[PDB]
A paper describes a structure:
To gain insights into the catalytic mechanism of Dpa, we used a catalytically impaired version of the enzyme carrying Y128F mutation that allowed us to determine the structure of Dpa bound to 1,3-DAP and acCoA. The crystals of DpaY128F grown in the presence of acCoA were soaked between 30 s and 1 min with 1,3-DAP before vitrification in liquid N2. The compromised activity of DpaY128F allowed us to observe the post-catalysis state of the reaction with Ac-1,3-DAP bound to one of the two DpaY128F of the dimer. The other monomer of DpaY128F was bound to 1,3-DAP that was oriented slightly differently in the active site. Binding of the polyamine pre- or post-catalysis did not introduce major structural rearrangements. Interestingly, the orientation of 1,3-DAP in the active site of Dpa observed in the crystal structure was similar to that observed in mouse polyamine acetyltransferase SSAT14, suggesting that these subfamilies are functionally related. Two densities corresponding to metal ions occupied symmetrical positions at the dimer interface and coordinate D80 and D81, damping the negative charges of the active site. These ions hold together a network of water molecules that connected and accommodated the polyamine substrate. At the other end of the active site, 1,3-DAP is stabilized by contacts to E116 of one subunit and F139 of the other, both located at the narrow entrance of the β-swap channel, together with α1 Y25 and V71 of the β3-β4 turn. This architecture defines the pocket that accommodates the substrate and likely provides specificity to the enzyme.
Here we have uncovered a GNAT-family acetyltransferase conserved in A. baumannii that is responsible for the acetylation of 1,3-DAP in A. baumannii in vivo and in vitro and renamed accordingly as Dpa for diamino-propane acetyltransferase. The crystal structure of Dpa reveals topological and functional differences from other bacterial polyamine acetyltransferases, adopting a β-swapped quaternary arrangement similar to that of eukaryotic polyamine acetyltransferases with a central size exclusion channel that sieves through the cellular polyamine pool. In this study, we have found a downstream regulatory element in this pathway: the polyamine acetyltransferase Dpa that specifically acetylates 1,3-DAP in A. baumannii to control the effective levels of the metabolite. The structure of Dpa revealed a dimeric architecture with a conserved acCoA and an acidic polyamine binding site formed at the dimer interface that shares properties with other polyamine acetyltransferases.
Author numbering:
A (entry chain A): -2 to 147
B (entry chain B): -1 to 147
Write the structure that this text describes.
């Protein structure tokens, strides 16, 4: 029996998780649309190489982390991408993101991943403090490029 | 036809492994055709991966490997241009240009938001290539890594 847990998300959690997923999208500039957020959360959940971990405190989902499998051609090995991390404001600064990333790290090690990689906004200093505390090192060697199609 | 940029098939993998091993060596890996081919086949069997090869008179001159990406913010998919390589003998002949032009057409057909990639900051050649193909340098995001091995 427990009162707090970080565990893999299930289909049964998607309805509650969609609210936090919609909040994460709003943080990134998106207009709130619970129905759209939920439909796409279901597509990502039903994607073979994606893994969602959620943080539940007193039966409430406080946050989540979405990871997906990466393939490193140079190393000829897999790794994990920490795609999205979010904690709802009511539960911030209580160690939720820390616990979510700690479980993400233990999971990646269990999967013999090379590393966990991510990209976060340069203007998001709060996230840089979180990732550095968790053992992430800033990549300097690479430059991102986008070719916009729509 | 005498030249073509097309999807890779199972039959191209023995020859494609040689190019993929060459691409690995450019990024500093030791040559190992068995390891290169085994991983190439694992990526080729991934349902979200897409390989295009440039073939000049039955010789593979180069390739591009793309994979599906999900944008949570846009609630839409996109493509990541993961690997691009042209064997030195066939360089500065438009092989990479044709591979990327095909990748863009494929991404548009798939209704992708964009094609995204990462390349070394000191790789002058790749920056000229991607800029020629309409890619824009983006420094609004910072990459972090948590090394496990
Ligand atoms: C960033 C975010 C995930 C942090 O979640 P959280 O549960 O509040 O974080 P924690 O309580 O585990 O904090 C862990 C560490 O992160 C850093 N951190 C977290 N919030 C911070 C803040 N507001 N300012 C500075 N550092 C902060 C600190 O180093 C902190 O350690 P400390 O509290 O001992 O100083 C949360 O604020 C959030 O959802 N933000 C919006 C989405 C986002 O930016 N995600 C990252 C990109 S995917
Ligand atoms: C980069 C690379 C793929 C280019 O392949 P390529 O088939 O020779 O390229 P193309 O002939 O299609 O050239 C397309 C454009 O790229 C640029 N380019 C290509 N080679 C270049 C070079 N040596 N110097 C400068 N710009 C160059 C030019 O803008 C060129 O247009 P142009 O020929 O009209 O001037 C090839 O040099 C290679 O395999 N390099 C090693 C692997 C690599 O760097 N891949 C990317 C790592 S993330
Ligand atoms: C950690 C992080 O990547 N945040 C941006 C969300 C799209 N990847
Ligand atoms: Mg890769
Ligand atoms: Mg994403």
């Amino acid at each position: 029996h427990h009162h707090m847990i970080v565990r893999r998300a299930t289909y049964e959690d998607l309805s509650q998780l969609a609210v936090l997923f919609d909040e994460y999208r709003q943080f990134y500039g998106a207009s709130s649309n619970l129905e759209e957020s939920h439909h796409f959360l279901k597509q990502r959940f039903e994607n073979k190489e994606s893994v969602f971990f959620i943080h539940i405190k007193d039966e409430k989902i406080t946050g989540f982390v979405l990871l997906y499998l990466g393939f490193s051609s140079v190393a000829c090995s897999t790794y994990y991408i920490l795609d999205d991390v979010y904690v709802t404001p009511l539960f911030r600064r209580q160690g939720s993101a820390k616990q979510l990333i700690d479980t993400a790290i233990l999971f990646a090690k269990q999967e013999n991943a090379l590393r966990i990689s991510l990209e976060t906004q340069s203007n998001n200093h709060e996230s840089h403090r979180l990732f550095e505390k968790m053992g992430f090192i800033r990549d300097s060697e690479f430059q991102t490029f986008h070719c916009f199609l729509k």
